[PDB]
């Protein structure tokens, strides 16, 4: 391993380097020697003070002071750092006296709108002042800054960081004094404190303080009032600040608290900016704000936000809108609505001309988006879409409009009606409230229309308690990894009891036809494929709640090998989805219980390797206990013996498996 001879050789090399004198370089060498230790530093300070007059030397000294401050956070390095212990603050007063002596000096609030020439000089000067204050050991610093010229602090944002260094949360008086000083500076010189750069820096510092400690943003009523007064400025009201305003909106969204910014307002601001980067950044900020609060106001408006605009696409503002729509599609909430918005924005043609702008082919394409999501306003591909369109219109109230369209569609109304009769009776049942292969396919289409385009896009977790058996299956899908009261964006229709009647009708229809396990298998596979594997989280959870409710209405005949097998395949697909993995874990167990007597086994053993032990832990532990019971049930007979499930479940459960079973 490491040897003390190497350390001694390194120390000798450091001493030899110290012998070879190389002002700033000598100071850096002295700092390196001091770090290697855990005097020469005083000699280096004297050498620097011999030429402390030059501005470049002063900037170099400030950079060295910043590096020395970084040594407490270098080599992890925030805490228990190697360099923090390597560099001791003891006996540094002699070497810091010359630095402090050199530190003495003896319009907009930003030096330059763009990359200022040598703004690092002012930043390092502020950092060196902070380092001198720290090496000495906050109202004194605030008073000194107030007495100091405005341009000195305005050159670099680090001074604001120095204001963040002071304990605003611990001592609200310091923050109040800083706010009063800023107000006095604004009154004396309007432009000095009226620049968006300084206000944005102060707001960012306040947000960082709030995020770091819970003390900040509390008892800051005066600070909030000052922030509102700053927002009351003409530029702030008119958003004269675009990258800065977008950053401020993003910071506000990241920071739950009362402010002048809202999610809908953030989306409107994102759409207002014609810059693609600013709009994309604001959309990313909104998405970060998503998954932590109700996004109904945004998810509902996502569907109509995107529309076809060739003229705007020439200006590529519509291109930025399409990018925002794609981002919202990547967002969980209202995946179907996002797909509908993307389809509306797209022209359904010239895909190669678009050439996948902003990075579709198979699943994100408008064809697959329309397949997964169908929206009603209420060439060959044109007719293919028009088939479902006329199905929707005959399913809608505008019967005469549908008839006129069909007359203009070169298709007889009765010709489509012959197969659309099931949807006709389905939505007639829907309209009323509180009241052989062809026929089988018709009833299948009716069941699918009950499943899709009728079930609530925001389905409540709680279900009807009409049937005690329904409560039984609700328990079977809620005992493992169940999260209740799961809401979504929009509710098209809710509390459809008629589905239960359908469960009664199919068993008695055409001597049991359309109630076969096969037809319900086709329906469930159709809905699962309609759930594209690339769809977002919220739509996946909604579809999962739908199919779980349908398996609740399912009869014991769905316990056959193929039916239950496709069910567990869909359940594993849900488990792959992270958010819906919770529901899938619960919905699996009953289907394993139904399959195990019928499996009497290679398929069961192969699907046994579906655990979450690789890639809410208490719910997983409960499901692991349930699975331990299940695998013991499978083991007691051990007819095939190829499961090898006891050790497999023991390893993930973190229970020490015994050698014998191993």
């Amino acid at each position: 391993s490491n040897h003390t001879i190497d350390c001694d050789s390194l120390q000798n090399v450091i001493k030899m380097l110290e012998s070879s004198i190389d002002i700033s370089s000598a100071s850096y060498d002295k700092d390196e020697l001091d770090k290697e230790t855990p005097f020469p530093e005083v000699l280096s300070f004297v050498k620097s003070n011999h030429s402390y007059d030059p501005i470049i030397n002063c900037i170099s000294t400030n950079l060295q002071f910043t590096i020395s401050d970084e040594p407490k956070h270098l080599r992890d390095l925030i805490r228990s750092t190697h360099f923090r212990d390597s560099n001791p603050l003891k006996t540094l007063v002699l070497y810091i006296m010359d630095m402090a002596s050199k530190n003495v000096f003896i319009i907009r609030n930003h030096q330059i709108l763009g990359l200022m020439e040598g703004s690092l000089e002012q930043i390092r000067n502020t950092d060196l002042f902070i380092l001198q204050k720290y090496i000495d050991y906050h109202d004194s610093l605030i008073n000194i800054l107030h007495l100091y010229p405005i341009e000195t602090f305005c050159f670099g944002m680090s001074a604001i960081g120095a204001y963040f260094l002071d304990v605003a949360r611990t001592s609200e008086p310091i923050f109040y004094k800083c706010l009063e000083i800023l107000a006095q500076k604004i009154l004396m010189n309007y432009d000095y404190e009226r620049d968006e750069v300084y206000l944005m820096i102060f707001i960012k510092i306040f947000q960082k303080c709030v995020h770091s400690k819970l003390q900040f943003t509390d008892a800051t009523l005066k600070l909030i009032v000052k922030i509102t007064k700053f927002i009351e400025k003409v530029f702030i009201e008119t958003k004269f600040s675009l990258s800065g305003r977008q950053t401020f909106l993003k910071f506000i969204f990241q920071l739950h608290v009362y402010s002048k910014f809202d999610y809908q307002k953030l989306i409107s601001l994102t759409l207002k900016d014609s810059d693609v980067c600013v709009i994309y950044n604001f959309v990313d900020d909104l998405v970060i704000f998503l998954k932590k609060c109700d996004k109904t106001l945004i998810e509902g408006f996502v569907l109509p936000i995107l529309s076809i605009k060739i003229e705007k696409s020439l200006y590529k503002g519509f291109c930025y809108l399409y990018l925002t729509l794609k981002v919202f599609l990547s967002i969980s909430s209202n995946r179907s609505a996002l797909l509908y918005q993307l389809l509306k924005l797209a022209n359904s043609y010239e895909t190669s001309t678009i050439f996948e702008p902003l990075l579709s082919a198979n699943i994100k394409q408008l064809f697959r988006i329309y397949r997964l999501e169908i929206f009603w306003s209420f060439s060959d591909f044109l007719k293919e879409n028009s088939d479902e369109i006329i199905l929707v219109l005959i399913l809608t109230k505008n019967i005469t409009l549908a008839k006129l369209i069909t007359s203009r569609m070169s298709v007889d109304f009765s010709e489509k009606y012959t197969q659309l009769i099931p949807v006709i009776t389905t939505y007639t049942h829907l309209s009323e409230v509180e009241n052989v292969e062809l026929l089988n396919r018709s009833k299948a289409f009716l069941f699918c229309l009950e499943m899709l385009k009728e079930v609530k896009e925001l389905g409540s977790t709680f279900k009807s308690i009409s049937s005690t058996s329904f409560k039984v299956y609700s328990q079977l899908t809620i005992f493992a990894n169940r999260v209740s009261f799961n809401n979504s964006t929009a509710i098209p229709f809710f509390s459809t009891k008629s589905v239960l009647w359908y469960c009664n009708r199919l068993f008695q229809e055409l001597e049991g036809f359309s109630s076969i396990p096969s037809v319900i298998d086709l329906v469930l596979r159709r809905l699962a494929i309609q759930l594209h594997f690339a769809t977002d989280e919220e739509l996946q959870v909604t579809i999962s709640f739908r199919l779980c409710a349908f398996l609740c209405f399912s009869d014991p005949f769905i316990t056959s090998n193929y039916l239950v097998m496709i069910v567990l395949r869909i359940a594993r697909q849900l488990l792959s989805i992270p958010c819906t993995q919770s529901l899938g874990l619960g919905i699996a167990r009953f289907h394993l219980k139904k399959f195990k007597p019928t499996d009497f086994f290679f398929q069961l053993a192969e699907f046994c390797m579906d655990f979450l032990g690789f890639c809410k832990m208490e719910a997983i532990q409960d499901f692991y206990t349930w699975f331990d019971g299940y695998v013991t049930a499978l083991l007691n007979f051990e007819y095939e013996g190829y499961g090898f499930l006891r050790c497999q479940i023991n390893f993930v459960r973190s229970v020490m498996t015994t050698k014998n079973e191993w």
Binding site: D191, F235, C319
Partner: protein, 377 residues
């Protein structure tokens, strides 16, 4: 009052939305400059609506344009650029509408049009994705202005033309959308005129090698475009940005073969110093696009060795730049060519015993450093 100053600036921008007649407005120009002296951008009294009004005022004034009024328009454009709040697509459209009448009678060398060019470049920076038609029109106008400046012999004019051309994805799109390859040849000729102008005493040598703090393939500045993201990252430290100005002037035609540079390398092998420098600047980014034979790479390495053996500083530096491009090349160099480059790097290291021959280590940094995939033995 400073808020009153910003209010007066907004009022002047609103007034400038009209054609302002035929009045010289020299006193008005001085007042506008004084207003822009404080809180030009940076103020709580200016408005983003006022910023849009100022942009429309600049467009209308440029439409009505054609001395003091030129300086006033330059100040208005500078203030509008200082206004960070502006719709990128709308700004680009207004800039193109103004640039129509601006190019009806334009003077690129004049500093009054320089702020207008800067505003157009700021609009086109975000207008590459948004409103590419007005951006393409502005790019064509900027290319014409760059050719006109390259006709002049001023080194600063050549640097400004190179910067305006790089102000470069728009230029690449225009080249891809150019009417024919003859337009690309004309652009190459204009860049050759720019290099000839840079050959004057007011500009440094065009070989552009041994750049200060040039960390090859390390950080950035390899292809100068995010989309390309090529290898061989050449870095300048302004000790070198002074050489990097001429490097970009050469890359105005080196970056794009005008980049199938196989036949271009075959036909351009005139052994000239300027030609060698241009080829060296081209190779690092156009090696893969050229898809030249390994024999061509070996011949380029041999030519670099021959030019480095020459006592001329310019020829040796161009050879060093070519060797640096070869060491980190977008195309796979021949094993014999790699060994020759290694020998050249060894000779450079031997010459590094003398302090004059820093330059040797900076030249072929990817060769000086452990280049990836090279045989360790």
């Amino acid at each position: 009052r400073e808020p009153h100053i910003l209010a007066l600036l907004d009022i002047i921008l609103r007034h400038t939305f009209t054609a302002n007649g035929s009045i010289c407005e020299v006193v008005c120009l001085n007042f506008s400059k004084a207003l822009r002296l404080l809180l030009s951008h940076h103020l709580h009294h200016l408005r983003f609506s006022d910023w849009q009004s100022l942009v429309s005022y600049c467009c209308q004034a440029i439409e009505k344009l054609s001395k003091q009024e030129v300086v006033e328009l330059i100040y208005v454009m500078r203030s509008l650029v200082q206004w960070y709040a502006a719709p990128i697509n709308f700004v680009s459209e207004q800039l193109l509408k103004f640039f129509e009448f601006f190019f009806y009678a334009y003077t690129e060398e004049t500093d009054a049009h320089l702020p207008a060019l800067q505003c157009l470049f700021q609009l086109c920076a975000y207008a590459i994705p948004n409103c590419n038609d007005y951006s393409a029109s502005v790019v064509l106008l900027v290319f014409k202005i760059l050719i006109n400046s390259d006709k002049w012999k001023r080194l600063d004019l050549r640097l400004q033309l190179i910067q305006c051309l790089a102000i470069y994805p728009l230029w690449s799109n225009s080249e891809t959308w150019d009417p024919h390859r003859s337009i690309r040849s004309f652009n190459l000729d204009l860049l050759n005129s720019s290099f000839f102008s840079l050959k004057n005493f007011l500009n440094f040598f065009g070989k552009r090698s041994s750049l200060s703090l040039a960390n090859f393939r390390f950080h950035t500045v390899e292809p100068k475009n995010n989309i390309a993201k090529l290898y061989d990252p050449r870095l300048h430290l302004f000790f070198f940005e002074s050489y990097f100005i001429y490097f970009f002037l050469a890359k105005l035609i080196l970056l794009k073969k005008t980049s199938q540079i196989e036949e271009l390398l075959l036909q351009a092998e005139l052994a000239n110093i300027s030609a060698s420098s241009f080829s060296l600047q081209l190779m690092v980014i156009i090696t893969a696009i050229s898809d030249n034979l390994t024999n061509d790479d070996l011949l380029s390495i041999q030519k670099m060795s021959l030019n480095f053996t020459e006592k001329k500083n310019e020829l040796q530096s161009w050879s060093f730049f070519i060797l640096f491009n070869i060491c980190y090349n977008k195309a796979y160099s021949s094993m014999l060519t790699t060994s020759c480059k290694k020998e050249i790097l060894a000779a450079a290291s031997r010459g590094l015993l003398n302090s004059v021959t820093p330059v040797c280590y900076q030249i072929l940094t990817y060769f000086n450093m452990y280049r990836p995939l090279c045989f360790a033995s």
